């Protein structure tokens, strides 16, 4: 039942959302980061200072070694592991068990987060970006292939409303209508590697940034639950900040705040910060729809930090964006739906919105 999947996500603010999963036989309980921005099922499988729990293959009667290694560097650090398969369940997702690939992380540099309370990552994106390569079938592909679970999942990330605790839901195999109000709007998945989408227009408080839309998707825009911030290409970030500074000129903040480095505290003038509208390409060529997020989303609690940051790898619509909405990763129809979340945080003057269509008279990069 979808009812039993509601609120199956937890996390700490800025440290991601995780779902409880079991691996192996007997079931080994682990908390797993729900990550639409990667495609590996990778779980700590060796002691680590930040890990209080980890996957123990030798305890699993159903573990099978793939006698294949996997190495994953990424500037900041890395993770390295040994590939195998084992039985996997999501106790509060579908009532099914799946033999999925597992990267048992045996060593990692700056991968695990201190106090996040998750022990692995569930990469929900496509095989194309899986490590070591696209032959390593991602978890969700195995799930759909092995079970009758419909090729669709939906994320309701609720945020907050010690680091603040966040809740949410991952509904696998369907759409839970009680999770959103109003209309579900779909934007095409441009390509099945990341959950790549097209942003055709953005405005800060109704004011168009007036950029060639290729700038919004340079070199790509993705929907990524494994990123906390709204990340924007340099040129768009600067214009966004400039425009947000202007609209909130009353009250001045250190540029260290706009840089997302330091917090700023009251004991909050929301109305001073503008709403941000992302226009996503519609299923119909020249149509688009906007998702409008409040400062309650792009100012996350710490006291808040500016949760909009610069990117050199294109737009990242992270949790900051997703927390306003019910997001449907309709993989069967290669599209992503956005609807106002039943849980999104808003005051008595503004509210996160999903509105369309908007029509125009080439945005992919
Ligand atoms: N939310 C939030 C905030 C908490 C951040 O939590 C984390 C903790 C760790 C990682 C991570 C380290 C290395 C990889 C990786 C790199 C390449 C291939 C496969 C993988 Cl697994 N990842 C996955 C990854 C990276 C970058 C973006 C996305 N979306 N996912 C990500 C987020």
From Swiss-Prot:
Domain-related comment: DXXLL motif is required for a proper endocytosis and retrograde transport to the trans-Golgi network, as well as for regulation of lysosomal degradation.
Highest taxon, organism lineage: Eukaryota
Active site: 35, 224
Subunit relationships: Monomer. Interacts with RTN1; RTN2; RTN3 and RTN4; the interaction leads to inhibition of amyloid precursor protein processing. Interacts with SNX6. Interacts with PCSK9. Interacts with NAT8 and NAT8B. Interacts with BIN1. Interacts (via extracellular domain) with ADAM10 (via extracellular domain). Interacts with SORL1; this interaction may affect binding with APP and hence reduce APP cleavage. Interacts with NRDC AND NRG1.
Enzyme class: hydrolase
Sample GO molecular function, one term: peptidase activity
Keywords associated with the record: Acetylation, Aspartyl protease, Cell membrane, Cell projection, Cytoplasmic vesicle, Disulfide bond, Endoplasmic reticulum, Endosome, Glycoprotein, Golgi apparatus, Hydrolase, Isopeptide bond, Lipoprotein, Lysosome, Membrane, Palmitate, Phosphoprotein, Protease, Signal, Transmembrane, Transmembrane helix, Ubl conjugation, Zymogen
Gene: BACE1
Stated family: Belongs to the peptidase A1 family.
Protein name (database record): Beta-secretase 1
Protein's organism: Homo sapiens
Function of the protein: Responsible for the proteolytic processing of the amyloid precursor protein (APP). Cleaves at the N-terminus of the A-beta peptide sequence, between residues 671 and 672 of APP, leads to the generation and extracellular release of beta-cleaved soluble APP, and a corresponding cell-associated C-terminal fragment which is later released by gamma-secretase. Cleaves CHL1.
Keyword Metal-binding: no
Gene Ontology biological process terms in this record: amyloid fibril formation; amyloid precursor protein catabolic process; amyloid-beta formation; amyloid-beta metabolic process; cellular response to amyloid-beta; cellular response to copper ion; cellular response to manganese ion; detection of mechanical stimulus involved in sensory perception of pain
Carbohydrate-modified residues: 95, 114, 286
Peptidase A1 domain sequence ranges: 17-339
């Amino acid at each position: 039942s979808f009812v039993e999947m509601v609120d199956n996500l937890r996390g700490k603010s800025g440290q991601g959302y995780y779902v409880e999963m079991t691996v192996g036989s007997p079931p080994q309980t682990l908390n797993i980061l729900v990550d639409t921005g990667s495609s590996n099922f990778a779980v700590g499988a060796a002691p680590h200072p930040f890990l209080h729990r980890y996957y123990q293959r030798q305890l699993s009667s159903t573990y099978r070694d793939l006698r294949k290694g996997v190495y994953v560097p990424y500037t900041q650090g890395k993770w390295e592991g040994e590939l195998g398969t084992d039985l996997v369940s999501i106790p509060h997702g579908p009532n099914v068990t799946v033999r999925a690939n597992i990267a048992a992380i045996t060593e990692s540099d700056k991968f695990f987060i201190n106090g996040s309370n998750w022990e692995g990552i569930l990469g929900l994106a496509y095989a194309e970006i899986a490590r070591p390569d696209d032959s390593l079938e991602p978890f969700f592909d195995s799930l759909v292939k092995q079970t009758h679970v419909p090729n669709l999942f939906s994320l309701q990330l609720c945020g907050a409303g010690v680091l603040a605790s966040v809740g949410g839901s991952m509904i696998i195999g369907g759409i839970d209508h009680s999770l959103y109000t109003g209309s579900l709007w779909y934007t095409p998945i441009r390509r099945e590697w990341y959950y790549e989408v097209i942003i055709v227009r953005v405005e800060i408080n109704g004011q168009d940034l007036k950029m060639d839309c290729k700038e919004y998707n340079y070199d790509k825009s993705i929907v990524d639950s494994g990123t906390t911030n709204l990340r924007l290409p340099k040129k768009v970030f600067e214009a966004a900040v400039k425009s947000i500074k202007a609209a909130s000129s009353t009250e001045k903040f250190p540029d260290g705040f706009w840089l997302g480095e330091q917090l700023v505290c009251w004991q909050t003038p929301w109305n001073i910060f503008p709403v941000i509208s992302l226009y996503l390409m519609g299923e119909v060529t020249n149509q688009s729809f906007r998702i409008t997020i409040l400062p309650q989303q792009y100012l996350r609690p710490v006291c808040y930090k500016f949760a909009i940051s610069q990117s050199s790898t294109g737009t990242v619509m992270g949790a900051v964006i997703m927390e306003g909405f019910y997001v449907v990763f309709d993989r069967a129809r290669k599209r992503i739906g956005f609807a106002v979340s039943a849980c999104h945080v808003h005051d008595e003057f503004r509210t996160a919105a999903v509105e369309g269509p908007f029509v125009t008279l080439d945005c992919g990069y």
